[PDB]
Amino acid sequence: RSSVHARWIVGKVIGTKMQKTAKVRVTRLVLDPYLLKYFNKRKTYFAHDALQQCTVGDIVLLRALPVPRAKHVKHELAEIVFKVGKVIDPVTGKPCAGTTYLESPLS
Amino acid sequence: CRLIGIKDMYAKVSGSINMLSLTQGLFRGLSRQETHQQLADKKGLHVVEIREECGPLPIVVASPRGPLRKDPEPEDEVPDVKLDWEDVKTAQGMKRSVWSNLKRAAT
Amino acid sequence: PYPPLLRAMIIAERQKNGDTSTEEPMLNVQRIRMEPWDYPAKQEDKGRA
Amino acid sequence: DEPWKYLESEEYQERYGSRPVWADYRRNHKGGVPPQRTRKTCIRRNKVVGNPCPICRDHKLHVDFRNVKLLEQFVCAHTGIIFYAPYTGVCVKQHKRLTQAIQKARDHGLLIYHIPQVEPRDLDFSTSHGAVSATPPAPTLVSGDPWYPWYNWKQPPERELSRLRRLYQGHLQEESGPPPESMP
Amino acid sequence: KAYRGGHLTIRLALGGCTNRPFYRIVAAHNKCPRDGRFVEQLGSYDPLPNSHGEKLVALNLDRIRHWIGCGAHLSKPMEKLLGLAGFFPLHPMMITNAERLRRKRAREVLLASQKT
Amino acid sequence: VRPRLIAELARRVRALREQLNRPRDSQLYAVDYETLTRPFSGRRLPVRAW
Amino acid sequence: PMKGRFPIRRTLQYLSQGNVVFKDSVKVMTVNYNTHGELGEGARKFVFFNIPQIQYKNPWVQIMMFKNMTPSPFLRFYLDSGEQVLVDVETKSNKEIMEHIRKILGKNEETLREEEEEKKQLSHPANFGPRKYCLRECICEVEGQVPCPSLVPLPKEMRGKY
Amino acid sequence: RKTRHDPLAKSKIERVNMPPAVDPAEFFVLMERYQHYRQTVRALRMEFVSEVQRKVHEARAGVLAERKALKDAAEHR
Amino acid sequence: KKPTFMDEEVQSILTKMTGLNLQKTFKPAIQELKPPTYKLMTQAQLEEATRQAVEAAKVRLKMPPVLEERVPINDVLAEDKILEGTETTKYVFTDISYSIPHRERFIVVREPSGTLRKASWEERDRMIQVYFPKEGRKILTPIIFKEENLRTMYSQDRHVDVLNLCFAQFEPDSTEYIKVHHKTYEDIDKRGKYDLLRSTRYFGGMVWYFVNNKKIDGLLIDQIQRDLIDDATNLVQLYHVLHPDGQSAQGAKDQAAEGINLIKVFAKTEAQKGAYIELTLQTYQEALSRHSAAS
RNA sequence: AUAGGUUUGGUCCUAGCCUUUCUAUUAGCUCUUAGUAAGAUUACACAUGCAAGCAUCCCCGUUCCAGUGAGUUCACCCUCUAAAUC
Numbered sequence A: 001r002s003s004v005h006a007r008w009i010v011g012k013v014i015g016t017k018m019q020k021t022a023k024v025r026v027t028r029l030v031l032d033p034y035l036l037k038y039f040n041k042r043k044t045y046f047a048h049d050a051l052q053q054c055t056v057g058d059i060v061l062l063r064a065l066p067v068p069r070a071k072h073v074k075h076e077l078a079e080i081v082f083k084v085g086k087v088i089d090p091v092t093g094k095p096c097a098g099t100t101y102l103e104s105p106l107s
Numbered sequence B: 001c002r003l004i005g006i007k008d009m010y011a012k013v014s015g016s017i018n019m020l021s022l023t024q025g026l027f028r029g030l031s032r033q034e035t036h037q038q039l040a041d042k043k044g045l046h047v048v049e050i051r052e053e054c055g056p057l058p059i060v061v062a063s064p065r066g067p068l069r070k071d072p073e074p075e076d077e078v079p080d081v082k083l084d085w086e087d088v089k090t091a092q093g094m095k096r097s098v099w100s101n102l103k104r105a106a107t
Numbered sequence C: 001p002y003p004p005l006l007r008a009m010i011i012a013e014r015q016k017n018g019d020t021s022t023e024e025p026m027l028n029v030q031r032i033r034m035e036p037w038d039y040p041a042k043q044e045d046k047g048r049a
Numbered sequence D: 001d002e003p004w005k006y007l008e009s010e011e012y013q014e015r016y017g018s019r020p021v022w023a024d025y026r027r028n029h030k031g032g033v034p035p036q037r038t039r040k041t042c043i044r045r046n047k048v049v050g051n052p053c054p055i056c057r058d059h060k061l062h063v064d065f066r067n068v069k070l071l072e073q074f075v076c077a078h079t080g081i082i083f084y085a086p087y088t089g090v091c092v093k094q095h096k097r098l099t100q101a102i103q104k105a106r107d108h109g110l111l112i113y114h115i116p117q118v119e120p121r122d123l124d125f126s127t128s129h130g131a132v133s134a135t136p137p138a139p140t141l142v143s144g145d146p147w148y149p150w151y152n153w154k155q156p157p158e159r160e161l162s163r164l165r166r167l168y169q170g171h172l173q174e175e176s177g178p179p180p181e182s183m184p
Numbered sequence E: 001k002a003y004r005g006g007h008l009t010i011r012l013a014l015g016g017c018t019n020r021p022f023y024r025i026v027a028a029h030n031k032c033p034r035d036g037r038f039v040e041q042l043g044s045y046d047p048l049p050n051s052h053g054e055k056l057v058a059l060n061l062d063r064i065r066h067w068i069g070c071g072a073h074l075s076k077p078m079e080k081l082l083g084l085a086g087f088f089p090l091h092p093m094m095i096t097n098a099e100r101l102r103r104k105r106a107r108e109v110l111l112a113s114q115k116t
Numbered sequence F: 001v002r003p004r005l006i007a008e009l010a011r012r013v014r015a016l017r018e019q020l021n022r023p024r025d026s027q028l029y030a031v032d033y034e035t036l037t038r039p040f041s042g043r044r045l046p047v048r049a050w
Numbered sequence G: 001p002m003k004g005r006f007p008i009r010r011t012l013q014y015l016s017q018g019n020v021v022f023k024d025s026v027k028v029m030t031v032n033y034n035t036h037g038e039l040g041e042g043a044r045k046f047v048f049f050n051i052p053q054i055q056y057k058n059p060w061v062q063i064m065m066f067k068n069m070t071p072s073p074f075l076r077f078y079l080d081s082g083e084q085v086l087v088d089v090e091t092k093s094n095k096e097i098m099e100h101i102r103k104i105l106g107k108n109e110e111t112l113r114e115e116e117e118e119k120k121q122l123s124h125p126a127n128f129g130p131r132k133y134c135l136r137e138c139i140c141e142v143e144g145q146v147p148c149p150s151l152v153p154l155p156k157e158m159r160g161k162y
Numbered sequence H: 001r002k003t004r005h006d007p008l009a010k011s012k013i014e015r016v017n018m019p020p021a022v023d024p025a026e027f028f029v030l031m032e033r034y035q036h037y038r039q040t041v042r043a044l045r046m047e048f049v050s051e052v053q054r055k056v057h058e059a060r061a062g063v064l065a066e067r068k069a070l071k072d073a074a075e076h077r
Numbered sequence I: 001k002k003p004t005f006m007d008e009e010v011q012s013i014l015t016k017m018t019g020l021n022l023q024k025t026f027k028p029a030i031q032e033l034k035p036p037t038y039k040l041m042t043q044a045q046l047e048e049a050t051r052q053a054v055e056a057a058k059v060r061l062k063m064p065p066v067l068e069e070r071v072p073i074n075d076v077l078a079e080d081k082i083l084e085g086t087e088t089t090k091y092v093f094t095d096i097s098y099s100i101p102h103r104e105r106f107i108v109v110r111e112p113s114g115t116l117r118k119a120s121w122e123e124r125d126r127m128i129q130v131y132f133p134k135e136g137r138k139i140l141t142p143i144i145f146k147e148e149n150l151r152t153m154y155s156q157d158r159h160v161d162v163l164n165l166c167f168a169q170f171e172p173d174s175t176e177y178i179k180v181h182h183k184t185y186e187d188i189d190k191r192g193k194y195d196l197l198r199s200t201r202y203f204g205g206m207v208w209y210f211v212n213n214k215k216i217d218g219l220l221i222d223q224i225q226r227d228l229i230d231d232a233t234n235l236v237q238l239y240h241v242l243h244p245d246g247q248s249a250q251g252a253k254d255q256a257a258e259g260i261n262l263i264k265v266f267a268k269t270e271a272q273k274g275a276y277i278e279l280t281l282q283t284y285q286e287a288l289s290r291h292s293a294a295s
Numbered sequence J: 001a002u003a004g005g006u007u008u009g010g011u012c013c014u015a016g017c018c019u020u021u022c023u024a025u026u027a028g029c030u031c032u033u034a035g036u037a038a039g040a041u042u043a044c045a046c047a048u049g050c051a052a053g054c055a056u057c058c059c060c061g062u063u064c065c066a067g068u069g070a071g072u073u074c075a076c077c078c079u080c081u082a083a084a085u086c
Ligand SMILES: [Zn+2]
Pocket: D041, D042, D043, D052, D053, D054, D055, D056, D057, D090, D091, D094
């Protein structure tokens, strides 16, 4: 299928100063083998987005493309997992700010 | 330990190898040992030994001299103990030394 | 006929798989053609130096 | 010459005792960690080094597969491992000879060692298989025709034999001849 | 590497010392060194007689079948040994050398008969 | 990766020179019939064809 | 002494003592957990104790942790078909989360021992190569065959002294 | 060994490649034996080729593979 | 049908005959030593640990299968007279494979007679041990499996270890395995250390061989000396089952014998030392009177 | 590291350096046999001898082996797919 190594990656939006493209920071857990401890190692991915729906600070999932479009754009946005501020709790599928329900789940 | 009667011990000294502090600290520890019978009396539980040489046979070494405590010992998952990095290094095999397991004479 | 080791293997595996089937284990030969040492090849599969 | 006498004689507990033979030897070296190999031989030519090993210092202590008490002294008691030469004090030659002495006593029976209870090699223990039972014989074998009859020499006609002479004359060799059957 | 042109070859690889051969049946490219990168080792051949004397051969027959099905070009000692096993038909050259031996033994028998 | 422009150029001009100035069969398969030595090759013929 | 509150979390036996092996369908694990509140205590313990084990036994699964964004702690699993698995973990414990994820999308002992058996299929005893991969380098070692010329001198059938 | 740009020595500038002299019937039976042996090893080789192709095809899509795939999908659901 | 060694009733009976002495099964052996671990638990978890040790003892004491001897295989696959006289010394070929069982692997021998003979049993075992080595087995036959060595071993009273070495070296269907096991059993029937062979897996194989080739008088003697009376009655039951046409079985089912009376019937019918086994039974009954008066 | 020597008029602590262990190269002195492993310091210059032929002409091979450590993240995995063997 796709020749892109990173199939599904969840990251954070950094800059939207490229039009139709989003710059995303994807951080994984890498083991430092002497301390035997997991530390976050970060990589920058370029994602193709058609609708300009993602702003900076959003948490976005990136799916791979069958072929890279540009020299660096090898992914496309699939869904905005967490928009800034307006965080819809998925468990009780309701809007919330953080740690507090903006509108009550007892509706 | 030849004057005491001990025959089978490992002992690594570190910090200042001062002879007069070495002897005194050794005697402090060897007189502040806690034995199996004292452990059994303190915890109210049976003290058992499981050797790899014999197998799964449990060998009771020390029993409480009074009543037997009936609620079991609390299994603290992921115990909070202070480990030693030299021991962990030796167990995992990154202790690369040309001095450790050298062929020496008797005792 | 199959070579004697192969014959032993395939008969043993068939009695292990079930039915005795004591027929002599023949394989087809007439599929293989008989080009001798005079048949010519192609120059394009060949090539001039 | 014959061992298993000295170790229950009197001079063994006169000079030695219940203590092992090697419980008196201290090898001389540059101090600290000893060299991780003893001498190769105490007896060079027929002369002895000034600090002989526990075996070489007493010529009465013969080593073979029947000196059971000596061999148990030189093997560990709570572990089934043979003591190494820096640990004991014996030569490289003496340690080698003691090692074959331990092995010879172990496979001759005059020594106790631990043997683990082993598991069966296989799971199915049947004997009805083509490699381990009878096979239906070949038609050639119930007859006497050679297997794959192109092995046998069959004389070609003189016509294509003369064709081969036409192809390879000039540098031709000598003629044909049928195979012999039985060798001397 | 790449080895422009070539094929796999189930061949014997020497792995012994001086005055002691030992061969390992390996599946190697034709263009690679004799003792080099083999894709898989498929057996062993001891030509030396034992104390009892058995000249040992060990073959991984299913993997031999697999590599022949994948297209391995077997070498002349390999067909010699596989024919001696009975996995392959016996080789025309080894039975022809046997035949040459029959005829030279016939020659020495007749010469010794004339001598005696 | 720094490009190998001069190597590609040499490859192209070698292929072109081979396609244009290829030797022909007349000067390729001629035979000096008394010594069996072909010109432009220098190799004689096998013993099955003298 | 090793630094940290629980030094046993970094001992390479705890890490290869975790038991969950993720299937090949999953790619992303996301743990939204709450740093405060008595109800997200199990999620906090799961993040503290078991995420190193999960990441050690599944090295190519991207695991991302999120702090106080939602009022309820939950796990999300993004799977390569495009699946978005949700497991809320409020009113739970770390071992309960362990068991839940190994039941839902952990591999079975069936597949795990089959994979180990395939590794054992790769390892072969009869092969004769260097000790890095094989067990015997030659038949110079097995008794009954001719010994190596280095260890035992060969008789005068050797050539040179033919 | 040598390359395409090594000059030839004089002992191979001139050296006759004399042919091995030929026997009639050992040669003819050698042709017959060779052609029979090549035919039967061609049969064995195509047998093994079909066997390998069969193993590949049944591993990719047989009946047990489909059974395991559908069981895995049902378990997942 | 005559029940064999692989049947549930005879297996349960031989299990009860062997018995489980934990201190003898899990015994300190002279191997490489690691520092022991310690645990602290209550009486209930101590009973749990002892029950798990008992289960592990059963796993360790799972019985070795007693099997019949093997027919020496002599099957010529092919004979190449053209090949005869070409080479000098034989050529052994082994299908090593990886997944086919060992007793299904194909090993052949090409001889200077041109005969492609399937390999013999000993050559088969030697090639299997060469190419698929198992821990403890050496292809050269150990010198300890000789008359004087085995006699010294028997004198040093290590018959369980005799059986262990024989199990490690020879396959259970081998003639050497059979001969060594029965020679050890004959030596222990001569001297007699059935307690030395108790709580070992070879105990019921010993019992099976003696009841098949009847020398069970010493077994009954040691049983009633060591008060294994239910074991003794069960062993006479095994005698009656394995030999149902015996006059002991006839008189037993005629007299409806159940226990000590069944032992008496066997003693009066076919015990070669019937006077001594009856005398020891009378002394055991005198002991019964003594501790019944004590009770 | 089972560690030891050394700061000082002396003691304690911290510390460096060194010793004891094993291997490889070279130098000195000195050397009996047998077997086996391994064997330019230099990407400096090379006399000379050989190292690619085969084969009914065509082709094929000389693009492989063998050598060196100059340069140096072109070595591993996945996708796609051209020689090549079936
Ligand atoms: Zn000495």
